[PDB]
Amino acid sequence: KTHVQLSLPVLQVRDVLVRGFGDSVEEVLSEARQHLKDGTCGLVEVEKGVLPQLEQPYVFIKRSDAAPHGHVMVELVAELEGIQYGRSGETLGVLVPHVGEIPVAYRKVLLRK
Numbered sequence: 001k002t003h004v005q006l007s008l009p010v011l012q013v014r015d016v017l018v019r020g021f022g023d024s025v026e027e028v029l030s031e032a033r034q035h036l037k038d039g040t041c042g043l044v045e046v047e048k049g050v051l052p053q054l055e056q057p058y059v060f061i062k063r064s065d066a067a068p069h070g071h072v073m074v075e076l077v078a079e080l081e082g083i084q085y086g087r088s089g090e091t092l093g094v095l096v097p098h099v100g101e102i103p104v105a106y107r108k109v110l111l112r113k
Contacts, residue, residue, distance in 0.1 A: 003110045005071050006036060008043040008061075009103035011096065013050045016042070018097040020055030025078040025085045032059040032076055032095045036111055042098035043107050046091050056080050059095040062088030064112055071110040 021031035035041035057080040077086030
């Protein structure tokens with residue numbers, strides 16, 4: 001399937017134990033996609049002061065369309081030193097590894113895979 005329905009645990013930035021996916025744009029997009037498939041991916045909602053607490057490169061989920069079965073269609077965009085790899089809509093949040101942190105909510109998304 002080109003799209004997969006996922007329910008992403010929303011994590012508080014200060015709970016996050018592993019604050020990024022790796023060390024290159026290509027690695028972080030690779031790892032994010034793997035964690036999304038394995039159900040080991042969390043979402044942090046971006047507000048003032050969140051991103052400087054996480055590790056670059058960043059992986060964003062961004063709205064790709066204007067929401068089948070409650071699931072917002074999203075795609076991945078990476079960012080490193082202010083350059084984005086991808087072009088998409090509004091940020092729903094930054095993806096991080098999930099290693100058992102307790103979420104505050106779940107975000108239903110349809111991921112372009």
